[PDB]
């Protein structure tokens, strides 16, 4: 389910920038859905669309530029433009649209998960992210890198947040074929255990040691596994045995 | 080469057609508004027959009457009909024994099991049989085989797997399977008695049954000798293969063209469809064989007899045949269905892939789909039928009835539901 | 030994079907499951017991199966010390070892 | 270096201007050729499925693949021997099977692209953008155009239809399929087959794979098939500067027949197939093939019968020749479905100057 506005206000203003995902074109212009300011459809004209082949580029699905000309803040009629774009402004507009889309994606999985309204979620998100920081996707990115933006307002859901984090991003399988020929071995094994965990280690067979490495954002798990391997290697070199790593 | 007698195995596959064959004989029933025996007779004539022998037991009087009425009874015929009358219910071994007891068998006699209609010329086949016979002294009988429709899927009753040689055209193994119908035995068997003599082994399944046999004078004697063989395909051929009498040869003729025998209901329908189309090269109804027939050809595979009346504004599909003396109303949608002789069709009736026999009344506002109606059985107002619903003799389906898929209706006035009397079983009425 | 029963089976394969096996079980005085187990041990097969008839996976012939049967009749019925009729099933740890009711001796139930 | 001379069968007296010979089985070539081009050539030479539309797409795909595989030498620039390579490829193609109008257009486009970016940019940045651009172009002028055509057709089709069709034109197959599936109308499809390529048969097979009511006919059987039947559709290869229909084999006769029996013909074409080359007959430039196609005695392609005929070189004064591409009359087709929705065939080069 997808509904309601992205920002605080329902209808846009003068000069502010938007974008359409065009379903059908060529009659008057395009009366298609927006993804920057509400899912309710607005209209572009076939006059301020051509700048410099014209019927082939847009068509279906592709991202196309919009700027709000005239607003009827009474019943619901929105005027949009492509040619007016402030030069390179097109690129900026596109970026903004992309950000909006990403934000929408973010607040869709959580809506389906906790079975709670999307509009409310949007309201709860778009205040220290969409107003203070700039756009919300960038804020989210910042949070993922180092958490600072989410701390402003208290979250009603933590499981949802966790899910979101997971989506943004995890156990990685690791098998170490331990084939030691050492004098004292059990102690060495214990020592290894005492360093590698400080993650989830399980034993099925005597020579085989099964370990699953926890990853923060998938790519970080390579650094830990390698470290563990190194530690293991260190462990048995002093005593007099060997550990084979696949 | 000349002077050959014919023996036709009739009234053998009764109760196989589960609803019908109880009051009237099996072979007397019309294929396309005309009896099935006639086609067989024609085929025999084409082949080269000098005397006709028919085996009758179940409702023989009617058969005799038919023979009397038939064209071959008059002195102009090269072949005369003399029927074999035997005690009720016996296998093909017993029949053979009986024949032997009588003693008319001379040279290369023709034995045909069931009723078969095919387009392939027989003289060449006969010649081949003769030449092969001339090769070695101990040669037995000929079997007919034709290439199937690429992959087998509609064949469950008799999907015989033929392991064959290319050099001699001789059968190695015969086996029946219920594999596509019931997943219990998806299976293949090969015997090692003829491995180090043939060498050229070709394993095949896609071959259709014809059951037309050209047999030497040895066969009845063989039958007399070994009384254990009741059947002619399952036990006999296998026995021959496994050296019952040492050093003997059998034939399996291969033809690219169409040749299928009558066996079940769906198969029968398919055969009828083929006949309607231009599958058989010379076998067309418009030529008129029975002399009383007045069939004529029309565009888009449509057959019309003389005195056929059809009302204006009725959209027809593909492949339709109408018998003589018909009166059809308005607003009918007819698709791939045969209408019998002197049938009275009402108004606003949708038909698809169905079959209608001789003298049947179809009631107003009815839908018929892939189902068969037998002779003198009438359909009333608002009857909705599904795929493969066989209706028996003189069954009076009155006002308002609905029957589901594969519902069989009895013919004789026993074990199966729906009876010959007023209304088919939705409210209990009958004997 | 005339105790060997005729195997009334069609070599029609892909799945080995033995419908006559009940008779074999009866005549030789043996539980049907043991024979199945032996067959399994002999060749990598998988199936289920059905009341009289077997559904065993594999295309196996009417001569190698016959050979197997002949072997079974040569060592599982026969006891080396004294040829006795009464033999019973025992699961003794993973490999099978049957016991004779007349004396009480452990025989190799695999070779 | 390649292979030259040695041609099978008689050269004939009439219709001698275009190549009809050549490599069927490869023996000794230059040790620098990318094998994908060779494989494509091998396919095209012995193809039975393709018909004007997909060939160009295939070529484009091949080119893209080549670009992906392309590595710039350390000494010379990105375009120094590349042009030579391209020329060689073209020569190979011509030797195998003569270049179409669409193919020519594609070549021109490629040339333009080559001119656009001058040798100064690095390897991994240039071709990254090139391949994407080409993909975009493909998306634009081909698939989208086809979709548009389909949609135009959709509105143009009325109630109760009986249609006679011909060719292995992909667009027509798409159209018919669409009719069968998403429109759910009363559509009847009648198929016409030709001797050089089994296109009709393929069409029939495709129809069967969907589940359509199909009548199957030939070029000879036409006098009885009409005796209810209305629409006639054909597949075009290219429209010239004159306006005449320069298409495949058995179309023109069908069109004539349609004209005779009241109801006119409708033909479909793309907004890139248009040519500046001027010709008004089949004698000018024609796709001529080896007489090996007219050897099999009916039924199927792989049968091989020792019947009556099986000699060409040994026979004294015998000319067995067949043509693949034909020039149909201008006035006979009335409907043309292009990129600009609807229009007449007499427009000829209205899109050519528009580019």
**HEC secondary structure over B368-408:** EECCEECCCCEECCCEEECCCCEECCCCEECCCEEECCCCC
Return left, alpha or beta for B355; rule: phi > 0 is left, psi -120 to 50 is alpha, else beta. beta
CA-based radius of gyration for chain C: 14
CA-nearest of D277, D280, D276 to D351 is: D276
Of residues D291, D353, D281, D287, the one with CA closest to residue D325: D287
D227 closest CB neighbour out of B299, B317, B318? B299
Mutate to test the interface with C, among B180, B187, B190 (most CBs of C within 10 A): B187
Q: Give the single-character DSSP code of D51.
A: -
Nearest residue on chain D to A59, alpha-carbon basis: D144
Q: Which residue of A has its CA nearest to D143?
A: A56
**Is the separation of the CB atoms in B391 and B419 below 8 Å?**
no
Please tell me if residue D109 touches chain A, with a CB cutoff of 8 Å. Answer: no
Residues in chain D: 355
Across D150-168, b (16+ Cβ under 10 Å) vs e yields bebbeeeeeeeeebbbbbb
Q: Which chain D residues contact residue B150 at CB under 8 A?
A: none
Q: Which residues of B touch C10 (CB under 8 A)?
A: 175, 187, 189
Beta-carbon-side half-sphere exposure of residue A33 (alpha carbons within 13 Å): 14
| Per-residue 3-state assignment (H helix, E strand, C coil) for chain A | CCCCCCCCCCCCCCCCEEEEECCCCCCCEEEECECCCCCCCEEEECCCCCCCCCCCCCCCCCEEEEEEEEEECCCCEEEEECCCCCCCHHHHHHHHHHHHHHHHHHHHHHHHHHCCCHHHHHHHHCCCCCCCCCCHHHHHHHHHHCCCCCCCCCCCCCHHHHHHHHHHCCEEEEEEEECCCCCCCHHHHHHHHHHHCCCEEEECCCCEEEEEEECCCCCCHHHHHHHHHHHHHHHHHCCCCCEEEC
Rg of the Cα atoms in chain D? 22
Q: How far is D85 from chain A (nearest CA, A)?
A: 31
Cβ distance B188 to C17 less than 8 Å, yes or no, reads no
SS3 B46: helix
Of D133, D148, D163, the residue that ends a domain is D148
Nearest CA in chain D to B315: D228
Residue D75 lies in a domain: yes
D3 in any annotated domain: no
Q: Which of B297, B300, B317 would best serve as a mutation to test chain D binding (most D beta carbons within 10 A)?
A: B300
Residues of C in contact with B188 (CB under 8 A): 12-14, 59
Domain assignment present for residue D241? The answer is: yes
Q: Does D205 touch chain A (CB under 8 A)?
A: no
Q: Are residues D25 and D95 in the same domain?
A: yes
Distance, in Å, from the CA atom of D64 to the CA atom of D285, rounded to the nearest integer, reads 30
Question: Which of B99, B125, B408 is closest to B251 using CA atoms?
Answer: B125
| B242 phi and psi angles, rounded to 5 deg | -75, 20
Chain B touched by C90 (CB under 8 Å): no
Do D164 and D113 share a domain, yes or no? no
Report yes or no: A244 and A177 within 8 Å, Cβ to Cβ: yes
d(CA C3, CA C72): 12
Tokens of A114: 């906790």
Instruction: Report yes or no on chains B and C touching (3+ CB pairs under 8 A).
Output: yes
What distance in Å separates the CA atoms of residue B244 and residue B238, rounded to the nearest whole number? Answer: 9
Minimal C-alpha gap between D228 and chain B (Å): 10
What's the Cα-to-Cα distance from D98 to each of A49, D21, D50, D63, rounded to whole Å?
42, 11, 14, 18
For tokens 């030529």, name the residue.
Answer: B287
Contact (CB, 8 A) for A155 and A114: no
Nearest Cα residue in chain D from B319: D215
Q: With CB atoms and an 8 Å threshold, state whether B188 touches C10.
A: no
Residues D258 and D245 placed together within one structural domain of the fold: yes
The tokens of A216 are what?
């923060």
Whether residue B188 and residue C59 make contact (CB cut-off 8 A), yes or no, is yes
CA B62, CA C42: separation in Å to the nearest integer? Answer: 64
**CA of B170 vs chain C CAs: smallest distance (Å):** 21
Residue D6 within a domain: no
Residue of B nearest to C13 (CA): B187
Residue D76 lies in a domain: yes
What is the rounded CA–CA span in Å between residue B175 and residue B187? Answer: 9
- D174 and D95: one domain? no
CB atoms within 10 A of CB B387: 14
Residue the block writes with tokens 């293969």: B241
After which residues are there C–N gaps above 2.5 Å in chain C?
51, 92
* Side-chain half-sphere exposure of B229, counting CA atoms within 13 A: 20
Asked if residue A95 lies in contact with residue A64, where contact means CB atoms within 8 angstroms, the answer is: no
Contact across the interface for C15 and B186, Cβ inside 8 Å: yes
D250 & D320 share domain: yes
Shared domain check, D211 and D309: yes
D213 close contact with B: CB closer than 8 A: yes
Chain C residue with CA closest to B175: the answer is: C12
Distance from CA of C14 to the nearest CA of B (A): 6
Q: Which domains does chain A have, with CATH numbers?
A: 16-88 (2.40.50.140), 89-169 (1.10.150.190), 170-245 (3.30.70.1130)
Contacts of A57 in chain D (CB under 8 A): 140
User: Which of D103, D126, D148 is the endpoint of a domain?
Assistant: D148
Residue D207 covered by a domain: yes
Q: Indicate the pairing of strand D232-235 with strand D161-166.
A: parallel
D243 lies in the same domain as D353: yes
Residue A219 forms contact with D (CB below 8 Å)? no
Contact present, A125 and A108 (Cβ < 8 Å): no
**Considering Cα of A190, then A195, then A196, then A197, what sign does the dihedral take?**
positive
Domain range enclosing D72: 11-148
With CB atoms and an 8 Å threshold, state whether D144 touches A53.
no
Residue D251 shares a structural domain with residue D285? yes
Q: Are residues D280 and D261 in the same domain?
A: yes
Q: Distance between CA B109 and CA B142 in Å, rounded? A: 11
The gap between the terminal CA atoms of chain C, to the nearest Å, is 20
Task: Give the chains touching A; criterion: ≥3 Cβ pairs < 8 Å.
Answer: D
d(CA D251, CA D246): 10
d(CA D9, CA D266): 39
Domain count, chain D: 2
Is residue D136 included in any domain, yes or no? Answer: yes
- Distance to chain D for B59, nearest Cα, Å: 44
φ, ψ for residue D90, nearest 5 deg: -60, -45
Q: B178 to chain C: nearest residue by CA? A: C12
Do residues B129 and B214 lie in contact, with contact meaning Cβ atoms separated by under 8 Å?
A: yes
User: CB contact, 8 Å: A62 with chain D?
Assistant: no
Selection from A115, A178, A124 nearest residue A154 by Cα: A124
Q: Exposure of D22 by Cβ count < 10 A (0-12 exposed, 13-18 middle, 19+ buried)?
A: middle
Which contacts of D174-179 are long-range, i.e. CB under 8 A and separated by 24 or more positions?
A: D174/D146, D174/D150, D175/D150, D175/D233, D175/D268, D176/D203, D176/D207, D176/D212, D177/D206, D177/D210, D178/D150, D178/D153, D178/D154
Q: What is the strand order of the sheet D238-239 is part of?
A: D238-239, D245-247, D326-328
Experimental technique, in short, is cryo-EM
B232 Cβ contact partners less than 8 Å away, ≥ 6 residues apart:
B92, B113, B213
For residues C36 and C54, the answer to whether their CB atoms sit within 8 Å is yes
Q: DSSP secondary structure string, D142-180?
A: IIHHHHHHHHHHHHH--SSEEEEEES--HHHHHHHHHII
3-state helix, strand, coil in chain C (%, to 5): 30, 20, 50
Contact (CB<8Å) A57/D140: yes
Do D78 and D203 lie in one domain? The reply is no
Identify the helix (H) or strand (E) that includes residue C36.
helix C32-42
Please report the sign of the dihedral spanned by the C-alpha atoms of residue B230, residue B231, residue B232, residue B236: negative
Q: Are residues D321 and D295 in the same domain?
A: yes
User: Does the beta-carbon distance from D141 to A59 stay under 8 Å?
Assistant: no
In A, which residues are within 8 Å of D140 by CB distance? 53, 56-57
Number of cross-chain residue pairs from B and D with Cβ atoms under 8 Å apart: 4
| Interface membership of B318 toward D (CB under 8 Å) | yes
D27 in any annotated domain: yes
Evaluate whether A224 touches A174 at the Cβ level (below 8 Å): no
Residue of A nearest to D354 (CA): A53
The angle formed by the CA atoms of residues A59, A64 and A66, to the nearest 5 degrees, is 130
Residues D153 and D209 in one domain: yes
Closest CA of chain C from B114, distance in Å: 29
Yes or no, beta carbons of B188 and C13 under 8 Å apart: yes
What are the chain A neighbours of D354 within 8 Å (beta carbons)? none
CA distance C55 to chain B (A): 9
Judged by a CB distance cut-off of 8 A, whether residue D281 touches chain A is no
Domain termination residue (choose one: D114, D148, D182): D148
Query: Which residues on chain D are in Cβ contact (under 8 Å) with B317?
Result: 213
| Residue D164 φ/ψ region, left for φ over 0, alpha for ψ in the -120 to 50 degree band, beta for the rest | beta
Work out how many CB contacts closer than 8 A connect A with D: 8
């Amino acid at each position: 389910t997808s509904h309601c506005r992205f920002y605080e206000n329902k209808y846009p203003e003068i000069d502010d920038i938007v974008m359409v995902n065009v379903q059908q074109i060529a009659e008057m212009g395009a009366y298609v859905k927006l993804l920057e300011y509400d899912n309710i459809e607005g209209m572009i004209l076939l006059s301020e669309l051509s700048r410099r082949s014209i019927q082939k580029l847009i068509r279906v699905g592709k991202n196309d530029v919009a700027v709000v000309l005239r607003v009827d803040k009474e019943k619901g009629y929105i005027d949009l433009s492509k040619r007016r774009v402030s030069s390179e402004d097109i690129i900026k507009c596109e970026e903004k649209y992309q950000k909006s889309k990403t934000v929408h994606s973010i607040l869709r999985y959580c809506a389906e998960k906790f079975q709670i309204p999307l509009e409310e979620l949007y309201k709860t998100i778009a205040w220290p992210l969409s107003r203070k920081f700039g756009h919300a996707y960038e804020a989210f990115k910042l949070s993922i890198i180092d958490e600072t933006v989410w701390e402003g307002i208290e979250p009603p859901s933590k499981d949802v947040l966790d899910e979101l984090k997971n989506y943004i991003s995890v156990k990685i399988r690791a098998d170490v074929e331990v084939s030691c020929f050492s004098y004292e071995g059990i102690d060495a094994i214990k020592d290894a255990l005492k360093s590698a965990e400080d993650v989830k280690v399980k034993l099925v067979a005597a020579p085989l040691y099964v370990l699953t490495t926890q990853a923060l954002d998938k790519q970080k798990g390579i650094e830990q596994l390698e470290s563990a391997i190194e530690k293991i290697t260190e462990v048995i070199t002093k005593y007099g045995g060997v550990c084979n790593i696949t | 080469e000349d002077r050959l007698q014919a023996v036709v195995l009739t009234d053998s596959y009764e109760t196989r057609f589960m609803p019908l064959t109880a009051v009237k004989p099996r072979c007397l029933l019309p294929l396309a508004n005309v009896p099935l025996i006639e086609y067989t007779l024609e085929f025999l004539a084409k082949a080269g027959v000098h005397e006709v022998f028919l085996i009758c037991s179940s409702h023989a009087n009617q058969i005799n009457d038919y023979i009397e009425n038939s064209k071959w009874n008059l002195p102009w015929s090269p072949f005369k009909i003399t029927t074999i009358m035997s005690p009720e219910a016996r296998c093909t071994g017993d029949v053979m024994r009986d024949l032997d007891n009588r003693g008319i068998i001379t040279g290369d006699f023709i034995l045909v099991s069931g009723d078969v209609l095919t387009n392939i010329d027989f003289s060449k086949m006969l010649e081949f049989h003769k030449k092969m016979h001339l090769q070695d002294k101990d040669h037995i009988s000929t079997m007919c085989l034709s290439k199937a429709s690429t992959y087998p899927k509609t064949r469950t009753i008799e999907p015989a797997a033929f392991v064959l040689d290319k050099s001699t055209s001789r059968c190695i193994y015969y086996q029946d399977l219920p594999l596509p119908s019931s997943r219990e035995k998806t299976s293949i068997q090969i015997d090692p008695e003829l491995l180090d003599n043939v060498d050229e082994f070709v394993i095949r399944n896609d071959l259709i049954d014809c059951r037309i046999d050209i047999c030497t004078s040895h066969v009845p004697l063989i039958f007399q000798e070994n009384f254990d063989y009741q059947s002619l395909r399952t036990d006999f051929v296998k026995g021959v293969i496994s050296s019952d009498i040492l050093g003997k040869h059998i034939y399996a003729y291969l033809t690219d063209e169409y040749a299928v025998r009558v066996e079940s209901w769906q198969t029968y329908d398919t055969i009828s469809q083929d006949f309607l189309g231009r599958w058989c090269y010379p076998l067309v109804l418009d030529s008129n064989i029975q002399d009383d027939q007045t069939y004529s050809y029309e565009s888009r595979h449509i057959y019309k007899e003389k005195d056929v009346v059809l009302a204006q504004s009725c959209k027809i599909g593909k492949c339709t045949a109408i018998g003589s003396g018909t009166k059809i109303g308005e607003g009918t949608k007819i698709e791939n269905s045969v209408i019998g002789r002197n049938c009275q069709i009402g108004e606003n009736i949708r038909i698809k892939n169905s079959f209608i026999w001789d003298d049947c009344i179809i009631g107003n506002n009815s839908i018929i789909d892939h189902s068969l109606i037998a002779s003198n059985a009438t359909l009333g107002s608002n009857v909705r039928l599904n795929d493969g619903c066989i209706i028996g003799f003189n069954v009076k389906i009155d006002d308002n009835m609905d029957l589901d898929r594969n519902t069989k209706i009895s013919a004789s006035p026993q074990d199966l539901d729906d009876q010959t009397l007023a209304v088919s079983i939705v409210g209990d009425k009958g004997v | 030994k005339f105790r060997i029963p005729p195997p009334v089976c069609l070599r029609d394969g892909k799945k080995t079907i033995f419908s006559n096996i009940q008779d074999i079980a009866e005549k030789l005085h043996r539980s049907p499951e043991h024979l199945i187990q032996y067959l399994f041990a002999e060749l990598g097969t998988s199936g289920s017991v059905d009341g009289k008839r077997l559904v065993i996976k594999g295309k196996f012939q009417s001569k190698q199966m016959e050979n197997v049967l002949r072997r079974y009749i040569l060592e599982y019925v026969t006891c080396k010390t004294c040829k006795s009729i009464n033999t019973e099933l025992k699961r003794e740890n993973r490999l099978f070892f049957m016991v004779c009711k007349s004396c009480g001796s452990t025989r190799s139930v695999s070779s | 270096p390649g292979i030259s001379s040695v041609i099978p069968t008689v050269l004939e007296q009439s219709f001698d201007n275009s190549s009809l010979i050549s490599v069927k089985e490869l023996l000794l070539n230059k040790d620098l050729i990318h094998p994908s081009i060779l494989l494509l050539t091998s396919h095209l030479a012995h193809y039975k499925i393709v018909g004007s539309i997909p060939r160009c797409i295939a070529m484009l795909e091949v080119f893209q693949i080549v670009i992906k595989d392309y590595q710039t030498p350390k000494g010379t620039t990105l375009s120094r021997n590349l042009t030579s390579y391209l020329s060689h490829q073209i020569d190979l193609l011509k030797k195998a099977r003569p270049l179409s109008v669409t193919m020519g257009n594609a070549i021109r486009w490629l040339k333009q692209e080559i001119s656009l970016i001058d040798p100064s940019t690095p390897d991994k940045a240039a071709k990254k953008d090139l391949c994407e651009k080409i993909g975009q172009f493909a998306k634009e002028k081909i698939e989208l155009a086809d979709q548009l055509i389909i949609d135009n057709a959709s509105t143009q089709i009325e109630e109760s239809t009986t249609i006679v069709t011909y060719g292995s034109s992909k667009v027509l197959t798409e159209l018919l399929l669409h009719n069968a599936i998403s429109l759910k109308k009363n559509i009847k499809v009648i198929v016409v087959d030709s001797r050089p390529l089994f296109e009709g048969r393929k069409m029939a097979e495709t129809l069967r794979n969907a589940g359509v009511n199909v009548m199957y006919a030939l070029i000879t059987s036409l006098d009885t098939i009409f005796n209810d039947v209305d629409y006639v559709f054909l597949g075009a290869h290219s429209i010239l500067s004159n306006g005449f229909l320069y298409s495949r084999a058995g179309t023109a006769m069908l069109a004539m027949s349609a004209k005779r029996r009241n109801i006119p013909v409708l033909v479909c074409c793309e907004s890139l197939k248009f040519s500046q080359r001027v010709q008004l007959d089949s004698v000018t430039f024609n796709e001529l093939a080896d007489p090996n196609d007219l050897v099999n005695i009916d039924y199927e392609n792989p049968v091989e019968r020792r019947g009556n005929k099986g000699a060409l070189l040994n026979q004294f004064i015998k000319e067995r020749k067949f043509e693949k591409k034909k020039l149909a009359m201008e006035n006979k087709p009335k409907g043309n479905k292009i990129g600009g929705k609807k229009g007449s065939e007499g427009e000829s080069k209205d899109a050519s100057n528009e580019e």
